[PDB]
Write a protein that binds this ligand. Structure first.
Ligand SMILES: CCOc1ccc([C@@H]2c3c(-c4ccccc4O)n[nH]c3C(=O)N2Cc2cccnc2)cc1
Length: 380
């Protein structure tokens, strides 16, 4: 069976209007696993909730942990994992936590207790990123000792052991500097390959967020910065294909063009205008792009990289859609990878609110559910 994870983000509930996303917007069968972004860590390496609203309390109610895990009542095949780390979390705390057997044990024991208390079936590590020989060996030890402690807890209690996964870098330099892949593979149930964010508004080069392959439209120095190169790289370095879960974005990345008459991939720009709901310069959600198209933006298909882009005046957006998801699912099956995961549930048109919707909940993620899972996600 293909593995079909999806990231839930606990901050999407703070978006306005049609963009507000809560666990009850999930629909059964959409994912095989939900990864909860994010759990947090104290200075002493014990774990805690990132957002006080994750926990049951007077002002939040049941809390996001309980609301996500309640989804298993109506989706009995669903498993959940708590993801520790992420971009904002940074590296310093991971570097300290991973430094010794004793420091790792504090975190490991605390994380196992915490996920059992709050009803998760696994621990996902999103350290961005281990870097250098010290981090590399400490990360190997962390994942090995975490799996071992999960095996020990399972034998002690008689329960199925917690899963151990990680969201991992896709760029060759970052992979080389931080990941000892042959010594990591035995101890992961699977990895979430972050095969996206290859080009973006941190730089002036206009390119694709998640091109499936390279294009000669972009400079040759970036020929490894695409989904297929990153998946091949992990496999060649020793990760079995069945453990490589290909990353799928439901957001896009965009630029304000330096010259509105120069619209080719490989042109130059600054960040796109901030979008209404995401409120982050240079990114936007699928349910924003659908309205841009309805409002007259011109859509192009890049045949080498196998992803769309759109142009609206001086705004140029790389994004993903049903068509690019479908071709990427054909790729996953043809190349034998273990599945595909989504960042995020909340950037798809989760409520079928797009003006051009045919009623389909989750038009993008539904492609994964159908092509990899045989699941037909309903219309609203
Ligand atoms: C130079 C690229 O810089 C970044 C690329 C990606 C992220 C993503 C993200 C977003 C976000 C991503 C896309 C659009 C809008 C958003 O707010 N918001 N919080 C997080 C977070 O922690 N991320 C990391 C992550 C972790 C696990 C699995 N995949 C990704 C952050 C920075």
């Amino acid at each position: 069976s293909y593995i079909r994870p999806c990231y839930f983000t606990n901050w999407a509930q703070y978006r306005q209007g049609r963009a507000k996303f809560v666990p009850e917007d999930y629909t059964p069968g959409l994912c095989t696993h939900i990864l909860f972004a994010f759990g947090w860590m104290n200075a002493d390496y014990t774990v805690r909730a990132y957002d006080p609203a994750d926990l049951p309390n007077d002002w939040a109610g049941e809390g996001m942990y309980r609301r996500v895990n309640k989804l298993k009542v109506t989706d009995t095949q669903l498993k959940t994992l708590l993801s520790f780390g992420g971009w904002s979390f940074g590296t310093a705390l991971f570097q300290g936590m991973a430094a010794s057997s004793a420091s790792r044990k504090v975190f490991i024991d605390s994380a196992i207790t915490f996920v059992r208390t709050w009803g998760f079936d696994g621990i996902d590590i999103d350290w961005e990123y281990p870097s250098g020989a010290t981090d590399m060996a400490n990360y190997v030890a962390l994942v090995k000792e975490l799996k071992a402690a999960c095996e020990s807890e399972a034998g002690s209690t008689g329960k199925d052991r917690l899963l151990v996964t990680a969201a991992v870098a896709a760029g060759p330099a970052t992979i080389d500097a931080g990941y000892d892949i042959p010594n990591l593979a035995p101890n992961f149930d699977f990895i979430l390959l972050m095969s996206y964010d290859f080009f973006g508004a941190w730089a002036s080069l206009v390119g694709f967020n998640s091109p499936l392959y390279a294009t000669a439209e972009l400079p040759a120095e970036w020929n490894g910065w695409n989904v297929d190169s990153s998946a091949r790289y992990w496999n060649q370095k020793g990760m079995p294909k069945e453990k490589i879960i290909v990353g799928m974005p439901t957001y896009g990345r965009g630029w304000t063009l330096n010259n509105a008459s120069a619209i080719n991939p490989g042109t130059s720009g600054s960040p796109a205008k901030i979008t209404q709901y995401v409120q982050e310069a240079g990114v936007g959600a699928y349910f924003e792009f659908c309205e841009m198209l309805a409002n007259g933006a011109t859509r192009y298909w890049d045949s080498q990289s196998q992803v769309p882009y759109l142009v609206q005046g001086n705004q140029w957006w790389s994004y993903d859609d049903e068509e690019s998801f479908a071709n990427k699912m054909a790729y996953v099956k043809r190349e034998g990878y273990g599945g595909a995961f989504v960042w995020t549930l909340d950037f798809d048109d989760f409520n079928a609110g797009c003006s051009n919707s045919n009623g389909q909940l989750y038009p993008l993620i539904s492609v994964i559910a159908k092509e990899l899972g045989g699941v037909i996600i309903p219309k609203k």
